[PDB]
Design an enzyme around this catalytic site. Sequence first.
Site, short mmCIF file in Angstrom:
data_model
loop_
_atom_site.label_atom_id
_atom_site.label_comp_id
_atom_site.label_asym_id
_atom_site.label_seq_id
_atom_site.Cartn_x
_atom_site.Cartn_y
_atom_site.Cartn_z
N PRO A 27 0.82 -1.22 0.00
CA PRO A 27 0.00 0.00 0.00
C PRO A 27 0.85 1.27 0.00
O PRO A 27 1.07 1.93 1.01
CB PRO A 27 -0.82 -0.15 1.28
CG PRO A 27 0.10 -0.89 2.20
CD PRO A 27 0.96 -1.80 1.35
N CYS A 28 1.36 1.61 -1.18
CA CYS A 28 2.22 2.78 -1.32
C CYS A 28 1.40 4.06 -1.13
O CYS A 28 0.36 4.23 -1.77
CB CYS A 28 2.90 2.78 -2.68
SG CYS A 28 4.52 1.99 -2.71
#
Length: 1036
Positions: free
Chosen positions: A712-713
């Site tokens: 989850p950048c």
Amino acid sequence: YIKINEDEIANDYPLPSYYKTSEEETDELILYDAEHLPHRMLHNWALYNSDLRFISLELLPMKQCDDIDVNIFGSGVVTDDNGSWISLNMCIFLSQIKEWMIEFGSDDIISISIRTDVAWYRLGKPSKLYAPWWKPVLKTARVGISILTFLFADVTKRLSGLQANDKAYISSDPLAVERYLVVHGQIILQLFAVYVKRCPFVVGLASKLEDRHHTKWIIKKKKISLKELNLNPRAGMAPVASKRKAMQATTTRLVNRIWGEFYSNYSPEREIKWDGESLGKTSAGEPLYQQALVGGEMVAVGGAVTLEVDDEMPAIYFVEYMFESTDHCKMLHGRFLQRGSMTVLGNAANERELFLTNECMTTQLKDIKGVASFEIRSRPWGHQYRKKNITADKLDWARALERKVKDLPTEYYCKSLYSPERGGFFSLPLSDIGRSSGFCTSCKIREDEEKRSTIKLNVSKTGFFINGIEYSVEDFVYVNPDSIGFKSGRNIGLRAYVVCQLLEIVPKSFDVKVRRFYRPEDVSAEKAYASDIQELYFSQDTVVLPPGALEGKCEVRKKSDMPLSREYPISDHIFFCDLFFDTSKGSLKQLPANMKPKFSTIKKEIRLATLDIFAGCGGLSHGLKKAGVSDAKWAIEYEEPAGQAFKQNHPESTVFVDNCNVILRAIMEKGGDQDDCVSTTEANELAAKLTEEQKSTLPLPGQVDFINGGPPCQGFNQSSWSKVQCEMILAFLSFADYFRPRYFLLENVRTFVSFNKGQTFQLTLASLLEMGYQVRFGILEAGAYGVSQSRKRAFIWAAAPEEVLPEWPEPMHVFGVPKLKISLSQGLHYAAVRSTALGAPFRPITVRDTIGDLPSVENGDSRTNKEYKEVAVSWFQKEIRGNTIALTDHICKAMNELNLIRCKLIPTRPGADWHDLPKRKVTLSDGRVEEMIPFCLPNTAERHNGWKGLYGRLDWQGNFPTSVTDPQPMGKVGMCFHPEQHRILTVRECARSQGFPDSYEFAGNINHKHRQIGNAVPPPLAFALGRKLKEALHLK
Ligand SMILES: [Zn+2]
């Protein structure tokens, strides 16, 4: 009394935003249950309507009123009054505020106050989110005090004369400034009246307010009487309270070194005689020479030379072979060795790293500027070789620094082949380069590609070749539909490939006559609904086309010979024909046996142990397991509901519901490598607090052969080191480095290749290449593989040097989206797969094909178990229902009465949205009169207008929009309503939109299930990637 509603004031205030907070929130009446009211003041206050939409303070009245049509609530922190007055520059939720007051700041210190029905509330500094709705009030107060300092048209001329330098400037246009003054009328009229009392300005302003009358009210006297409950929307809701603390990620000493070095170096911190004897002769009868002298230094096959360039930097060419020309000329052939800085890596590549390329060149020996040191790296692969590689890397870096200090020539190394046409870095064919036999493999490839450009007719006069595809008589071909001769409504007028049978090749350099086949959608939409995807109708229409209008070859059989196995994402170019379509009458009939059309005639254990990081509900894992390539033996997921769902759907898996960094620290502590860990003390404490049983089942290097999952950048400006240090992509890459899996599939959002000016993508590629991987990248749209929800995802494949990089699955459904291009450098672009917008083997999947048979449910349901009431009709429903007999997760989020009324008032027409609600003061059975129209956007700001899609229904023949990942029935709902019923899309419908089979189960609250569905890779696209990887796994 005269009041002005949002229609006129909406211009100054920005686009409407909505109020959010944490679970800390307490009632207001219970605190002070009971002119002479408590004077408690407010910190970090905010105001909103019943829809939690931020609303300006200007919408509250000045005097008593029996019935106030506009309802307004507030929030803040109740604190002791200190007499704080403004001149320039526990959490509670309020009840229905009944009025507001300006207190006359005789010493230019005017204050702000409000009256609910219980106590006074002085207003302090508001929340930062409400500041955009707070500043215009101060601006109009400054305007009022400016006119007060000055002392109707004379005043307007005076204040229009002022320029933008003064704070009280509005506009140089008399009409615009008069509109501004009349819009903010009472806020100035009352301020003038609390000082002059009967000044002509006051009566003129009152007359203008009457001229712009929008709402009347009755002025009255003391009416305070507690007769309300709370009616506050905030009352009773439990806000999201996670906001997980972005602690520094646990990383290996390699990934941390790379990222830290990048973010510290950047960011806001002649004789040409031969040598030897000929070993042979070329095809053209030229001598073949292995070694040569150039200006006293050495040149040999397998080395690298430099070519003189006009400035800039000299180019390096890898020598392939040397030959002596017929006219006694020293000539050589080389392959371009692209520098790392000029590739997609950019500034994230080492100075000493060069990449082989397909471009070749041939030049005289005397044109060589010089020879540079150059070696090919072939380090062995495996997890047990990591320490030796680390030591070698340190030694080589020290040697490079020492050589750079003494300004010695730079030594280059090459270990990857950079192919921009295929868009990735691949393994060198060590047995096919530097052969010194006079034959260039890249030259042969280029010549073959050149041969794949001519429309040549074979000697048999019964076929031809186009795009390297052989067409013959009686074959079945694809023809572009054009060649023959709203947000949801994207695939509303797009036609698939027109299937044809090529009969005769008539010369004209020639044209092909083709008999036409009719798809079910040609007859009617309903027929396309209740029919198979692979069905074709026979016909007797023959048309003549140029040979350049043929896209590919397929097969056409009967119903009896169709394949038994039916994968959902269809990868077979096979159709069946049973019926005859007559264009004259449009009637489908049985195929007569008089002609008997010549249809087509028939004539291991590679499953990989899998660690799935950030698994979620398990869409990617399910897709890869259905393809027979993944085991999903280990999974890691932070969210408890997602881990529960993964354990529910994959009983044999081992699921760690814990932080990724903590799990990595525990794994690396168990293996004995603590000096290679870059982790915080909190991570160490959390990892040390683990059950011995859990630590006994942790993965270790050598037991993992496939690592997949999507980090989850956060993304979103050039962030500093202290902010990019906490990203989960670093932990994911550390996992990949420590375990050294044979394969590595990274998935992320489409904008992953553009976060932080594209530095994250370059750094990820640089880390994967520094590990020793083959890296390829692409962007795939799930909508072209079977799902009805458009979703663009960036995939990065990484493979061991001795393995085969999987190809990209061929899209097979029509989807109206252009080529998805990743920009490498120098204006070059790479497209993963062809854009199936003008043609594809199969028609697009519509909303009716997806949710056309599920039983109807009212607005708000909790029955998690139901039974089907209609037999599956279309192809998608038949395929996705399977043998399931119990319908699960067919529940929808419950909307309040106002939102239910709004949804019911939306017409059931394609493209309908919030623009269609009538303007009328509605009154639900609660005593709360509300505006029916949800938003009041400013008339100006055309780009910031046209808010189409909000409160929008879904077209029956359209497709699911991207904005249904997490439906929110409070504020900006978006295009989420049902095409025919008055409800939001259920969890089961959303799962079907992404291709999740009906047997899949989700866990947690409805919000949690929707979040799991929206955050997961579609099982169709995952299965397509899995079968491509399975095909790649059988070559090795
Ligand atoms: Zn060549």
